[PDB]
Design a protein around this ligand. Structure first.
Ligand SMILES: [Mg+2]
Ligand SMILES: [Mg+2]
Ligand SMILES: [Mg+2]
Ligand SMILES: [Mg+2]
Ligand SMILES: [Mg+2]
Ligand SMILES: [Mg+2]
Ligand SMILES: [Mg+2]
Ligand SMILES: [Mg+2]
Ligand SMILES: [Mg+2]
Ligand SMILES: [Mg+2]
Ligand SMILES: [Mg+2]
Ligand SMILES: [Mg+2]
Ligand SMILES: [Mg+2]
Ligand SMILES: [Mg+2]
Ligand SMILES: [Mg+2]
Ligand SMILES: [Mg+2]
Ligand SMILES: [Mg+2]
Ligand SMILES: [Mg+2]
Ligand SMILES: [Mg+2]
Ligand SMILES: [Mg+2]
Ligand SMILES: [Mg+2]
Ligand SMILES: [Mg+2]
Ligand SMILES: [Mg+2]
Ligand SMILES: [Mg+2]
Ligand SMILES: [Mg+2]
Ligand SMILES: [Mg+2]
Ligand SMILES: [Mg+2]
Ligand SMILES: [Mg+2]
Ligand SMILES: [Mg+2]
Ligand SMILES: [Mg+2]
Ligand SMILES: [Mg+2]
Ligand SMILES: [Mg+2]
Ligand SMILES: [Zn+2]
Lengths: 192, 136, 49, 79, 126, 59
RNA sequence: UUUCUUGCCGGAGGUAGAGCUACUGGAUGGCCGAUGGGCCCCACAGGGUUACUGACGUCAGCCAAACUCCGAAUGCCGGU
RNA sequence: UUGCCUCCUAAAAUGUAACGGAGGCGCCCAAAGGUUCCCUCAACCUGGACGGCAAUCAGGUGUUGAGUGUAAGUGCACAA
RNA sequence: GUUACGGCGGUCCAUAGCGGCAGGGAAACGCCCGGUCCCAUCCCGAACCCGGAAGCUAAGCCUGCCAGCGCCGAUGAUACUACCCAUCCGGGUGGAAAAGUAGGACACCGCCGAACAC
């Protein structure tokens, strides 16, 4: 299941620094860096609005097609430095990638469906590491809860993992734990 | 009340209350949380009141995580006394809160009730906070 | 005192050359050690005064 | 109503006394310290209270020798 | 496969010897004018080097594997005295009569003492 | 390339390395100016007192 | 001119910050599961069942003037 | 409370105040001084009559978490 | 000069460590055999010390390959900061981390000796 890369435009940062980054961030642009086996850390401003839009559409983990001054590159979002408060993305890290390339990544895990009513489902690890190709990276994968029995644990090793993707996390990492819903005489008994 | 079992030193200086919370700024345990916006000293009185507020509002089943601990003691010298004669005896306990730190976190099925319990807690705190969700 | 001041004197010339301390509880007898005598010119036994 | 503390001792003025590239006489003491934070290096001796001093005239220079910060005296050329 | 579990006496001998050597080395060293006479010793042979530690070089050397030394029908002390006189002659040729004795982490005595006293009488003052 | 430096502010309330940088530049009063070469020593010497002076190159 | 300023060069630090599975303490929630808890067959042997309490450990998020695997800017010493 | 010593305050040189925060000292050891040589602990697992986690024995893992007369700090496994 | 060699060293002493897999025994390095003699055990020829060459690559040593643990580690951003603006907010110019990422690394250099055509 190939995911189509998203087409952004970028242009080489003329000069570097906190003043330059603050100014660029002020003009609705995100400073970022390309690296990888391209062996050239290349400093690129890109459109903040388009960056946020594509991150909304295809999560944190999505291939991009960068147009660097006409040259055409394939990139993959490695990290995003984001402000804790203003929540704007400050910086981005872009591994260079090509087809048929396995890469390690972290994919969010969103529990889906309703559970049995007497107990609450609670996730400890929201993200699971997987090894997968550049184009075949899943932006999210689901875990099944449909009327479980009494409280039991779920680990990464029993998830319906996609095709062409490989678990990296040790299979005994807990993801979602159904824990019995606290009674009336049990909910306010902890916390002091 | 949340009180440390022992502190190595029982009379410290006032915690420096400047900067932005660098550690502990994300919601990880539950799905909704209360995330701070101002520097303050959250005493165990505030924490207990807020936790009881959340428990009263939801009242059925759901997990409340107080991921801040009041373990820093503020002392107070006895009343009617002049200046001098050394530092006082410690008599309340505090967590040092920066703008950015998720204070309380909640896990509960529905949305509106969870939001309302979180704002009920917020009203008991000496700061401005906001409700933050498990996703960016 | 239990660690009083004591003096050491050379036997062959009876000159008091050194003053030290020692424990009377642990060294009840006179302390004697081979020290250096400036006028005898060489190392000689020195005994407590 | 009283503080059960309020005593301290005199400052002993410890620390590095001659820094790198500084010409010294033979015998100048170069760093006062408690333990052996700086270990004696080439042509540098160590005193009774762990005071490092120069055993020859030259220029001070620091180094690391098998995970040990050391102080050495380098013979400057005679003009 | 038969995986051994213990430590061998070779390891303890080798590294304890090295530790004794280093403890010794904390206090002797070699210049150009007073070099260091370092000694190795095994169950078959005894080795000596004359070292200038300012460089990590060796100025003269000898062992009990040379033609003449293997030509001696005598005892290990005889090989030791031969090595001592040979290394003394080689040092004297190299232009040195003063040295410091690095006994090499072995206890001074036996064949090492025989070597050292042979060098002592042969012209090297130490 | 070389510069002209004109003093615009005064040295009342100025810290001591600022006043000494001004004195080292050879200028004493407000509106007084000097002309000098554009090396790194001058560039630093005016970097200290940029808030007190204004500079322009010649040509 | 030894003074002072600016540039460059040679230094020693443990502050701001940060980090803590790098120590000393605090400290949140999970996970497995003891030892010690109770019971059966029936012995106080032995075995397993059970809200057990749940050592240790481990996952994730944290905290410190008298914590530090780390760690600046300035200032300071010298030279030029 | 008044002299001395150690740490934090003390803002990475030194120094720095308050009826600021914590403790020690007014000794001890004829070896616990000098030198020469030799060795590596604490803890943990396994195997052993008393003997139990624990006492001494044996095997292993163990680079410093033990110890350093005596507060604290700086040191010390090259060993102090 | 060649060396699946032996020593003595050096390096802001792990980019060198730990672990794992596969080899070697020319001389060497070892283990190994014995306690007549120097010397030795707070008892023990186990260690140390002295003599010997029946057996060995099983170790130690060294060689080659593995990045699993430990180690090293940018660029960029950020924190913090000097100075300066600035009526609190905040900004500009210089310096710039820690953590993390890309990755690196199964050390390198030197001087003597051994055997080998010499
Ligand atoms: Mg501060
Ligand atoms: Mg945070
Ligand atoms: Mg932190
Ligand atoms: Mg409020
Ligand atoms: Mg006695
Ligand atoms: Mg002091
Ligand atoms: Mg001394
Ligand atoms: Mg003394
Ligand atoms: Mg064995
Ligand atoms: Mg200058
Ligand atoms: Mg400099
Ligand atoms: Mg430095
Ligand atoms: Mg300090
Ligand atoms: Mg801080
Ligand atoms: Mg503590
Ligand atoms: Mg600190
Ligand atoms: Mg200071
Ligand atoms: Mg300072
Ligand atoms: Mg003062
Ligand atoms: Mg007192
Ligand atoms: Mg002693
Ligand atoms: Mg003695
Ligand atoms: Mg043992
Ligand atoms: Mg390693
Ligand atoms: Mg062979
Ligand atoms: Mg024998
Ligand atoms: Mg082998
Ligand atoms: Mg070997
Ligand atoms: Mg490391
Ligand atoms: Mg950088
Ligand atoms: Mg304003
Ligand atoms: Mg880093
Ligand atoms: Zn006399």
């Amino acid at each position: 299941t190939a995911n189509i890369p998203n087409k952004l435009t970028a242009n080489v940062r003329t000069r570097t620094g906190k003043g330059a980054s603050r100014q660029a961030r002020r003009d609705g642009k995100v400073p970022a860096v390309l690296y990888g086996h391209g062996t050239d850390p290349q400093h690129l401003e890109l459109n903040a609005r388009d960056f946020a839009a594509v991150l909304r559409s295809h999560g944190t983990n999505a291939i991009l097609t960068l147009d660097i001054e006409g040259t055409e590159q394939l990139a993959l979002t490695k990290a995003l430095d984001v402000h804790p408060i203003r929540r704007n993305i400050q910086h981005a890290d872009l591994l260079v990638v090509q087809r048929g390339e396995k890469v390690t990544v972290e994919v969010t895990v969103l529990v889906e469906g309703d559970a049995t009513p007497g107990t609450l489902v609670t996730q400890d690890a929201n993200t699971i590491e997987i090894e997968a190709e550049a184009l075949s990276i899943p932006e999210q994968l689901t875990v099944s809860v449909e009327g479980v029995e009494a409280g039991t644990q779920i680990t990464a090793g029993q998830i319906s993992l996609p095709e062409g993707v490989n678990l990296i996390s040790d299979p005994e990492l807990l993801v979602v734990n159904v824990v019995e819903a606290p009674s009336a005489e049990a909910l306010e008994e902890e916390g002091a | 009340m949340l009180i440390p079992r022992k502190v190595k030193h029982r009379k410290q200086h006032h915690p420096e209350q400047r900067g932005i919370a660098s550690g502990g700024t994300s919601v990880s345990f539950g799905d909704y949380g209360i995330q701070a916006l101002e520097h303050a000293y959250i005493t165990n009185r505030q924490i207990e009141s807020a936790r009881i507020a959340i428990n009263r509002h939801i009242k059925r089943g759901g997990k409340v995580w107080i991921n801040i601990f009041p373990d820093r003691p503020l002392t107070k010298k006895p009343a009617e006394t002049r200046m001098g004669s050394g530092k006082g005896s410690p008599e309340w306990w505090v967590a040092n809160v920066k703008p950015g730190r998720v204070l309380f976190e909640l896990s509960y099925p529905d949305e509106k009730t969870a939001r309302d319990a979180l704002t009920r807690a917020i009203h008991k705190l000496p700061i401005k906070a906001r409700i933050v969700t498990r996703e960016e | 005192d239990v660690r009083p001041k004591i003096t050491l004197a050379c036997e062959v010339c009876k000159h008091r050359n050194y003053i030290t301390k020692k424990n009377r509880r642990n060294d009840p007898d006179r302390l004697e050690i081979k020290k250096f005598c400036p006028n005898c010119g060489t190392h000689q036994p020195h005994k407590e005064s | 109503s009283s503080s059960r503390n309020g005593r301290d001792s005199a400052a002993q003025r410890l620390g590095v006394k001659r820094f790198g590239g500084q010409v010294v006489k033979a015998g100048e003491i170069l760093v006062r310290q408690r333990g052996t934070h700086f270990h004696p290096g080439v042509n540098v001796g160590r005193g009774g209270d762990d005071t490092l001093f120069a055993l020859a005239p030259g220029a001070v220079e620091f180094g690391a020798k098998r995970g040990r910060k050391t102080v050495n005296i380098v013979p400057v050329a005679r003009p | 496969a038969h995986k051994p579990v213990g430590q061998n006496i070779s390891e303890v001998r080798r590294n304890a010897r090295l530790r004794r050597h280093a403890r010794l080395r904390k206090k002797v060293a070699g210049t150009a004018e007073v070099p260091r006479l370092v000694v190795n010793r095994s169950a078959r042979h005894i080795h000596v080097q004359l070292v200038n530690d300012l460089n990590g070089t060796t100025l003269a050397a000898a062992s009990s594997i040379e033609a003449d030394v293997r030509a001696i029908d005598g005892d290990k002390k005889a090989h030791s005295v031969r090595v001592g006189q040979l290394i003394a002659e080689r040092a004297k040729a190299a232009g040195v009569e003063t040295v410091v004795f690095d006994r090499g982490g072995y206890t001074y005595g036996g064949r090492i003492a025989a070597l050292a006293d042979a060098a002592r009488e042969a012209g090297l003052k130490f | 390339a070389e510069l002209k430096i004109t003093q615009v502010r005064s040295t009342i309330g100025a810290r001591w390395k600022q006043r000494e940088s001004l004195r080292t530049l050879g200028l004493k009063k407000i509106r007084q100016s000097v002309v000098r070469e554009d090396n790194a020593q001058t560039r630093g010497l005016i970097n200290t007192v940029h808030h007190l002076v204004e500079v322009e190159e010649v040509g």
